[PDB]
């Protein structure tokens, strides 16, 4: 479970991202597609070349859902219910992929927020992306 300190740690880290959220989301997506090519099989309809507009636009969407998660950290299921429905019944993404995406987010954050990525913040952010993942795969069956 996310502890109060975790919540504080995440609201803090995510605050600095501020307007760079769409950029970091896109970057994490890109890191994911190159580092773990099997993840590309869920986006056969996307132009996946560096900096193309489908990846940019999708990046913004992922990050915004994440901002929504942070802003509603104490009530994640309700807040992310619809995304949970989408991933479970429509996209049907294998759960193993949520970890690869989460790792790439963490790498992007560590690369972009040198001062803020302390070990404790690192721990909280990881636990946090795991909680989001769980919620997003909760209705699979």
């Amino acid at each position: 479970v996310l502890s109060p300190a975790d919540k504080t740690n995440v609201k803090a880290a995510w605050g600095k991202v501020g307007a760079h959220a769409g950029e970091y989301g896109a970057e994490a997506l890109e890191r994911m597609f190159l580092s773990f090519p099997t993840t590309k099989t869920y986006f056969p309809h996307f132009d996946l070349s560096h900096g193309s507009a489908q990846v940019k636009g999708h990046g913004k969407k992922v990050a915004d859902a994440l901002t929504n998660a942070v802003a509603h950290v104490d009530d994640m299921p309700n807040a992310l219910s619809a995304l949970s429905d989408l991933h479970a019944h429509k996209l049907r993404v294998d759960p193993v992929n949520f970890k690869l995406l989460s790792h790439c987010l963490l790498v992007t954050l560590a690369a972009h927020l040198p001062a803020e990525f302390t070990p404790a913040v690192h721990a909280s952010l990881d636990k946090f992306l795991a909680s989001v993942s769980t919620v997003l795969t909760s209705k699979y069956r």
Binding site: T38, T41, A88, R92, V96
Partner: protein, 146 residues
């Protein structure tokens, strides 16, 4: 596929007793029922709304026979799974867009099916040989992904 001679004959011995037709259909059907999201690849197959619809679906049964036929053919070339499966690999990646994790799930579902049909005969050591075989097969189908 570091498979010892003892492991190799055990796999083969057992495989002899297998009815490839009914086993492949059983395995693929269960795959679709136990891990429902693996249905996303077979929307053209018709009704998959309930367990009996899936398990009794003729296209599921026909496709399972297809899958197992290739697996068998793979059991005849244990020292060269990658070569044997290369074209199937390219296909599942470039044309069909199947996340390789699905190959690992099928393997485990296949092990349950074998266990189910052979009971006591499916000893822990024989299970251990098959686990190596299904990973190897999973790995071979994953190998040409890019």
């Amino acid at each position: 596929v570091h498979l010892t001679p003892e492991e190799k004959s055990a796999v083969t011995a057992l495989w002899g007793k297998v009815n490839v037709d009914e086993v492949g259909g059983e395995a693929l059907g269960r795959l679709l029922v136990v891990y429902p999201w693996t249905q996303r690849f077979f929307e053209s197959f018709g009704d998959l709304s309930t367990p009996d619809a899936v398990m009794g679906n003729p296209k599921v049964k026909a496709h399972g026979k297809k899958v197992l036929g290739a697996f068998s053919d793979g059991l005849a070339h244990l020292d060269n799974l990658k070569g044997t499966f290369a074209t199937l690999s390219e296909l599942h990646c470039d044309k069909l867009h199947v996340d390789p994790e699905n190959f690992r799930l099928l393997g485990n579902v296949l092990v349950c099916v074998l266990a189910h049909h052979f009971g006591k005969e499916f000893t822990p050591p024989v299970q251990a040989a098959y686990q190596k075989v299904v990973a190897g097969v999973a790995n071979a189908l994953a190998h040409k992904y890019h």
